[PDB]
Design an enzyme around this catalytic site. Sequence first.
Site, short mmCIF file in Angstrom:
data_model
loop_
_atom_site.label_atom_id
_atom_site.label_comp_id
_atom_site.label_asym_id
_atom_site.label_seq_id
_atom_site.Cartn_x
_atom_site.Cartn_y
_atom_site.Cartn_z
N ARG A 18 89.79 44.95 76.77
CA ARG A 18 89.22 43.67 77.18
C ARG A 18 88.35 43.08 76.08
O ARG A 18 88.54 41.93 75.67
CB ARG A 18 88.41 43.85 78.46
CG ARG A 18 88.18 42.57 79.24
CD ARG A 18 87.70 42.86 80.65
NE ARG A 18 86.26 43.04 80.71
CZ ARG A 18 85.60 43.47 81.78
NH1 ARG A 18 86.23 43.78 82.90
NH2 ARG A 18 84.27 43.59 81.72
N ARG A 73 83.56 33.89 79.73
CA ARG A 73 84.57 34.42 78.84
C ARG A 73 85.66 33.37 78.64
O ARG A 73 85.83 32.48 79.47
CB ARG A 73 85.15 35.71 79.42
CG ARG A 73 84.11 36.78 79.64
CD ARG A 73 84.63 37.93 80.48
NE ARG A 73 83.58 38.89 80.78
CZ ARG A 73 83.65 39.79 81.75
NH1 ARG A 73 84.72 39.89 82.52
NH2 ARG A 73 82.63 40.62 81.94
N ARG A 106 77.82 49.45 80.83
CA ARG A 106 78.82 49.39 81.88
C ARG A 106 79.17 50.78 82.40
O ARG A 106 79.23 51.01 83.61
CB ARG A 106 80.08 48.69 81.37
CG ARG A 106 79.88 47.25 80.91
CD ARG A 106 79.28 46.38 81.99
NE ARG A 106 79.17 44.99 81.57
CZ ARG A 106 80.08 44.06 81.79
NH1 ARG A 106 81.20 44.34 82.43
NH2 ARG A 106 79.87 42.82 81.37
N1 LIG Z 1 75.78 41.67 93.79
C1 LIG Z 1 76.66 40.86 93.16
N2 LIG Z 1 77.45 41.39 92.20
C2 LIG Z 1 78.35 40.62 91.54
C3 LIG Z 1 78.47 39.20 91.88
N3 LIG Z 1 79.42 38.68 91.08
C4 LIG Z 1 79.88 39.69 90.30
N4 LIG Z 1 79.24 40.84 90.58
C5 LIG Z 1 79.45 42.16 89.94
O1 LIG Z 1 78.84 42.17 88.66
C6 LIG Z 1 79.64 42.89 87.73
C7 LIG Z 1 79.79 42.05 86.47
O2 LIG Z 1 81.14 41.60 86.46
P1 LIG Z 1 81.73 40.75 85.23
O3 LIG Z 1 80.62 40.04 84.49
O4 LIG Z 1 82.78 39.78 85.72
O5 LIG Z 1 82.38 41.91 84.32
P2 LIG Z 1 83.65 42.75 84.85
O6 LIG Z 1 83.46 43.14 86.29
O7 LIG Z 1 83.78 43.99 84.01
O8 LIG Z 1 84.90 41.91 84.72
C8 LIG Z 1 81.00 43.10 88.39
O9 LIG Z 1 81.24 44.49 88.62
C9 LIG Z 1 80.94 42.38 89.71
O10 LIG Z 1 81.50 43.19 90.75
C10 LIG Z 1 77.57 38.70 92.94
O11 LIG Z 1 77.61 37.50 93.30
N5 LIG Z 1 76.72 39.56 93.52
N1 LIG Z 2 96.30 49.10 86.67
C1 LIG Z 2 95.82 48.91 85.41
N2 LIG Z 2 96.30 49.61 84.36
C2 LIG Z 2 95.83 49.43 83.11
N3 LIG Z 2 94.86 48.56 82.80
C3 LIG Z 2 94.29 47.79 83.75
C4 LIG Z 2 94.75 47.92 85.15
N4 LIG Z 2 94.03 47.06 85.88
C5 LIG Z 2 93.18 46.42 85.03
N5 LIG Z 2 93.34 46.85 83.76
C6 LIG Z 2 92.58 46.39 82.57
O1 LIG Z 2 91.19 46.60 82.82
C7 LIG Z 2 90.49 45.37 82.84
C8 LIG Z 2 90.25 45.01 84.29
O2 LIG Z 2 89.21 44.06 84.39
P1 LIG Z 2 88.93 43.34 85.80
O3 LIG Z 2 90.26 43.04 86.45
O4 LIG Z 2 87.94 42.23 85.53
O5 LIG Z 2 88.24 44.54 86.61
P2 LIG Z 2 86.75 44.42 87.20
O6 LIG Z 2 86.72 43.09 87.91
O7 LIG Z 2 86.66 45.63 88.10
O8 LIG Z 2 85.90 44.51 85.96
C9 LIG Z 2 91.38 44.32 82.20
O9 LIG Z 2 91.05 44.18 80.81
C10 LIG Z 2 92.77 44.90 82.34
O10 LIG Z 2 93.52 44.66 81.14
#
Ligand SMILES: Nc1nc2c(ncn2[C@@H]2O[C@H](COP(=O)(O)OP(=O)(O)O)[C@@H](O)[C@H]2O)c(=O)[nH]1
Ligand SMILES: Nc1ncnc2c1ncn2[C@@H]1O[C@H](COP(=O)(O)OP(=O)(O)O)[C@@H](O)[C@H]1O
EC number: 2.7.4.8
Length: 191
Positions: free
Chosen positions: A134, A41, A145
């Site tokens: 986001r 991203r 998701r």
């Molecule tokens: N099992 C596993 N899960 C992961 C790893 N890295 C990220 N994740 C999970 O995969 C999901 C994808 O996350 P991401 O692509 O960053 O999207 P986001 O969590 O919504 O910001 C997330 O909920 C992470 O907790 C990893 O190394 N192993």
């Molecule tokens: N306490 C909060 N209140 C409102 N919005 C939030 C809060 N925490 C996170 N967010 C929003 O939700 C998303 C969180 O993403 P992230 O921090 O990557 O969570 P995850 O790693 O669990 O996906 C971001 O876009 C952020 O703007």
Amino acid sequence: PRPVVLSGPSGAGKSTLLKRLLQEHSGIFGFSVSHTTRNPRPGEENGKDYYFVTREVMQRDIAAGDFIEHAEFSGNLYGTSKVAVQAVQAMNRICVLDVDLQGVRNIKATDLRPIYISVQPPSLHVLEQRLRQRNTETEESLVKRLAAAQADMESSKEPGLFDVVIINDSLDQAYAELKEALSEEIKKAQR
Ligand SMILES: Nc1nc2c(ncn2[C@@H]2O[C@H](COP(=O)(O)OP(=O)(O)O)[C@@H](O)[C@H]2O)c(=O)[nH]1
Ligand SMILES: Nc1ncnc2c1ncn2[C@@H]1O[C@H](COP(=O)(O)OP(=O)(O)O)[C@@H](O)[C@H]1O
């Protein structure tokens, strides 16, 4: 001290709370840089947020035993490599991991023996709203998701799965509760 596993639904605030914790306590905590096959991203940096690799590299890495665990999530591969965890240990830091529910169960059988923290949204509706702002996923990826997210919220109440559950309504309060749950970890590290 013990390593720290953060798990929770997509967008509940895992990344946000972790990013702050790594700033205030950069001497105490170290981020485990997972591998992923999804595209970066904007603002994400290779070697900091993820090891961004193609699926051929990720599969060859798996075939070589590089990973403590790996899981597929929304059509992409993620994995915690041994190298990533050792890098934090070689810095004399507490390892913090950000993984999904599959990773949590995967880690539950390794020799990491970490603390397990679940970060949850106040409601599933708020979780969808936060993901919409986001806007890093297509609606096809967004819909996937929420399907995986509901499984996280249900498994948050499992009696012996997570050590601390944190509802992220206010970042100030959620980070205050995150620090409170890591007081023993911080105290042992600092001694
Ligand atoms: N099992 C596993 N899960 C992961 C790893 N890295 C990220 N994740 C999970 O995969 C999901 C994808 O996350 P991401 O692509 O960053 O999207 P986001 O969590 O919504 O910001 C997330 O909920 C992470 O907790 C990893 O190394 N192993
Ligand atoms: N306490 C909060 N209140 C409102 N919005 C939030 C809060 N925490 C996170 N967010 C929003 O939700 C998303 C969180 O993403 P992230 O921090 O990557 O969570 P995850 O790693 O669990 O996906 C971001 O876009 C952020 O703007």
